[PDB]
Amino acid sequence: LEPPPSTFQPLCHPLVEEVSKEVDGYFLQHWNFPNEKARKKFVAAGFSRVTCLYFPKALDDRIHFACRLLTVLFLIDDLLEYMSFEEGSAYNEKLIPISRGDVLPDRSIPVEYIIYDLWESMRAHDREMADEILEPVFLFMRAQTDRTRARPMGLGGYLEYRERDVGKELLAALMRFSMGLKLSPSELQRVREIDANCSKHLSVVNDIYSYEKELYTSKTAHSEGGILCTSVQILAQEADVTAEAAKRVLFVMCREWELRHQLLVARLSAEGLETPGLAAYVEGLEYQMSGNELWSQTTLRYSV
Amino acid sequence: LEPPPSTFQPLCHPLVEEVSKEVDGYFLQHWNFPNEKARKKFVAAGFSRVTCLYFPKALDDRIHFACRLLTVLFLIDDLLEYMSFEEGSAYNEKLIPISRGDVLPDRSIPVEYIIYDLWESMRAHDREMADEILEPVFLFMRAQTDRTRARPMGLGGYLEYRERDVGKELLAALMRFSMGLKLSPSELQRVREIDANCSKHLSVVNDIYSYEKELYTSKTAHSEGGILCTSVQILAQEADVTAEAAKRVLFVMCREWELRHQLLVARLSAEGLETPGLAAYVEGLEYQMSGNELWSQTTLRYSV
Ligand SMILES: CC(C)=CCC/C(C)=C/CC/C(C)=C/CSP(=O)(O)OP(=O)(O)O
Ligand SMILES: CC(C)=CCC/C(C)=C/CC/C(C)=C/CSP(=O)(O)OP(=O)(O)O
Ligand SMILES: [Mg+2]
Numbered sequence: 001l002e003p004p005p006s007t008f009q010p011l012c013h014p015l016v017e018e019v020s021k022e023v024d025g026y027f028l029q030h031w032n033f034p035n036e037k038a039r040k041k042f043v044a045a046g047f048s049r050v051t052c053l054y055f056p057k058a059l060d061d062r063i064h065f066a067c068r069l070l071t072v073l074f075l076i077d078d079l080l081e082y083m084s085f086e087e088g089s090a091y092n093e094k095l096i097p098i099s100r101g102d103v104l105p106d107r108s109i110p111v112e113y114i115i116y117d118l119w120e121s122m123r124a125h126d127r128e129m130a131d132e133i134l135e136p137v138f139l140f141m142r143a144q145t146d147r148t149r150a151r152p153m154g155l156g157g158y159l160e161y162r163e164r165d166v167g168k169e170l171l172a173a174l175m176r177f178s179m180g181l182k183l184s185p186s187e188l189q190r191v192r193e194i195d196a197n198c199s200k201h202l203s204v205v206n207d208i209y210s211y212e213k214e215l216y217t218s219k220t221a222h223s224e225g226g227i228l229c230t231s232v233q234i235l236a237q238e239a240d241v242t243a244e245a246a247k248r249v250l251f252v253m254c255r256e257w258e259l260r261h262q263l264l265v266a267r268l269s270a271e272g273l274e275t276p277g278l279a280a281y282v283e284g285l286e287y288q289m290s291g292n293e294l295w296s297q298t299t300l301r302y303s304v
Numbered sequence: 305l306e307p308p309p310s311t312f313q314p315l316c317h318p319l320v321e322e323v324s325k326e327v328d329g330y331f332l333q334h335w336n337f338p339n340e341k342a343r344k345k346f347v348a349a350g351f352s353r354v355t356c357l358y359f360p361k362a363l364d365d366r367i368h369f370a371c372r373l374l375t376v377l378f379l380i381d382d383l384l385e386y387m388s389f390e391e392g393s394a395y396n397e398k399l400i401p402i403s404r405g406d407v408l409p410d411r412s413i414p415v416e417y418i419i420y421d422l423w424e425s426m427r428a429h430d431r432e433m434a435d436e437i438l439e440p441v442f443l444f445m446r447a448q449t450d451r452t453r454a455r456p457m458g459l460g461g462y463l464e465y466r467e468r469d470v471g472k473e474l475l476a477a478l479m480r481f482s483m484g485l486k487l488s489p490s491e492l493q494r495v496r497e498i499d500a501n502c503s504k505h506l507s508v509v510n511d512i513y514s515y516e517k518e519l520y521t522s523k524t525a526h527s528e529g530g531i532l533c534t535s536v537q538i539l540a541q542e543a544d545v546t547a548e549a550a551k552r553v554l555f556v557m558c559r560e561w562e563l564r565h566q567l568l569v570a571r572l573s574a575e576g577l578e579t580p581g582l583a584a585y586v587e588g589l590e591y592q593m594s595g596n597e598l599w600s601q602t603t604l605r606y607s608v
């Protein structure tokens with residue numbers, strides 16, 4: 001799969017080696033892995049590396065919080081594949097009061113106390129910005145087990161649902177937290193179209209690279225939790241082509257969304273509407289798109 | 305607009321100039337053109353040229369029938385743009401029994417006697433093969449004014465409907481008639497998937513090149529008859545990109561359908577199922593695809 005040309009230069013946080021060591025090391029002590037094979041596969045995924053490619057301009061003392069959060073969410077995302085929608089929903093709903101800090105964790109259950117301690121530490125660092133990540137996380141969690149996954153979707157309807165299931169909004173709030181980048185509600189409302197476009201790119205690039213893993217899961221895991229819900233299958237069905245052909249076509253559409261991101265950013269500036277915070281923010285989204293792609297292309301999570 | 309590479313090479317019927325003069329001449333004599341500007345525009349389109357690109361291996365004494373049939377269907381296709389769905393349906397339905405030879409034309413009305421005389425002449429030349437074009441033409445005519453054009457469609461639903469509106473089956477029956485190429489019902493069943501894939505390519509290539517013409521019609525002609533119904537607009541809507549971006553993505557998808565055509569034909573041959581008639585037929589479909597594209601790239605119908 002030769003990626004078509006992009007004008008985006010991916011960038012990686014300069015503390016990625018140290019933070020990956022710290023965070024992988026934390027999860028290897030605390031998380032319950034079913035065996036050695038799983039522990040090695042965990043390290044091979046490089047979950048702190050994807051984080052550092054997503055947020056290459058995070059503050060040095062904040063990048064580790066983001067790595068911890070995306071790491072725990074990835075581990076949960078995989079666990080849900082062995083569950084029904086109802087089981088998965090119960091699992092996620094238990095973590096929500098714990099994430100808010102309202103209910104104490106059972107210390108003999110690593111997902112509970114990892115989540116509790118992580119969000120406590122985030123609020124201890126920046127309460128206001130940490131709090132702004134909560135509802136976006138919950139929105140994503142609830143999307144993950146939404147029964148709409150077992151209903152037929154066309155490309156447009158899928159992308160609208162996928163914006164939640166991909167965690168676009170939590171990733172935006174986490175990006176802002178990690179950079180200490182505060183935006184007003186007026187600034188936030190102004191970039192909604194830019195956010196919705198960026199979401200499509202993150203989602204589809206992920207779908208392209210994760211298709212084989214998800215196909216295998218769909219054949220071996222739970223009939224609900226493991227269900228194949230991906231633009232790759234949707235376009236292959238709609239257009240009657242192979243999944244491989246669908247990927248080639250979808251990658252071209254991803255470059256069209258890159259072009260649209262540039263035009264939308266230009267138009268924001270050409271109207272009177274770009275602020276310094278908004279420029280840092282839309283540039284940050286660019287890094288999410290290119291970093292997501294660079295990680296997806298290199299991670300053993302998708303290639304083995 | 306740079307077409308991506310293709311391995312399909314077009315061919316044009318050897319008698320295209322002399323047949324074009326004969327057929328343009330008959331319509332210029334008989335058809336009620338409104339004025340000299342319309343007469344010039346009609347010649348500029350090159351309707352016999354597209355027919356000769358579609359069917360370059362037509363028998364020399366049958367190609368003119370195909371040029372006449374396609375030429376009258378094009379003229380009607382443009383007339384319907386100024387009509388409501390109801391008016392268009394009434395207009396087409398009156399021609400259906402006339403096409404069958406079951407109802408005599410009003411000789412004061414050119415479309416009726418042109419349609420009647422043409423089909424009588426094709427039945428006189430080859431009764432059985434002419435009769436085989438009838439229902440495919442009527443299926444196409446009925447699709448042209450179907451209210452489903454005025455309702456939302458996804459990419460898959462559009463391609464399914466568009467197979468009828470683009471005349472895929474009538475073009476197949478006409479190709480066979482023009483070549484005297486007789487296929488059994490079993491042979492035809494073997495290439496159903498190849499026909500379906502070919503329809504998508506003809507449809508989408510037409511959609512890409514005829515977009516600017518159709519956009520202009522949609523804004524100036526009848527709100528129903530002229531309604532925009534095209535993969536360019538549907539993909540743009542599904543993905544939230546411009547029309548020009550959608551055309552880029554669609555062209556790549558068209559090359560995927562070419563690859564699929566080649567794989568399906570290879571499989572048919574490998575399984576020992578490619579009869580000499582089927583080999584002629586599938587090569588014929590390839591000329592429709594490449595011929596349609598070369599004409600679409602060059603006709604004044606789409607560039608002015
Ligand atoms: C999209 C991406 C790499 C990263 C964002 C990083 C993370 C953990 C974001 C939180 C939202 C999640 C779990 C997205 C995975 S989409 P998925 O379930 O399709 O991911 P998969 O294909 O299973 O790796
Ligand atoms: C697709 C093609 C060039 C040719 C087949 C030639 C003809 C006349 C086939 C009969 C069925 C029709 C009228 C198709 C035109 S698609 P349309 O209405 O979208 O054609 P337009 O874009 O208006 O030129
Ligand atoms: Mg997943």
Ligand SMILES: [Mg+2]
Nearest residue numbers: 077144165166
């Ligand atoms: Mg997921």
Ligand SMILES: [Mg+2]
Nearest residue numbers: 206207210214
């Ligand atoms: Mg995925």
Ligand SMILES: [Mg+2]
Nearest residue numbers: 381382514518
């Ligand atoms: Mg038309």
Ligand SMILES: [Mg+2]
Nearest residue numbers: 381448469470
């Ligand atoms: Mg038409």
Ligand SMILES: [Mg+2]
Nearest residue numbers: 510511514518
């Ligand atoms: Mg057209």
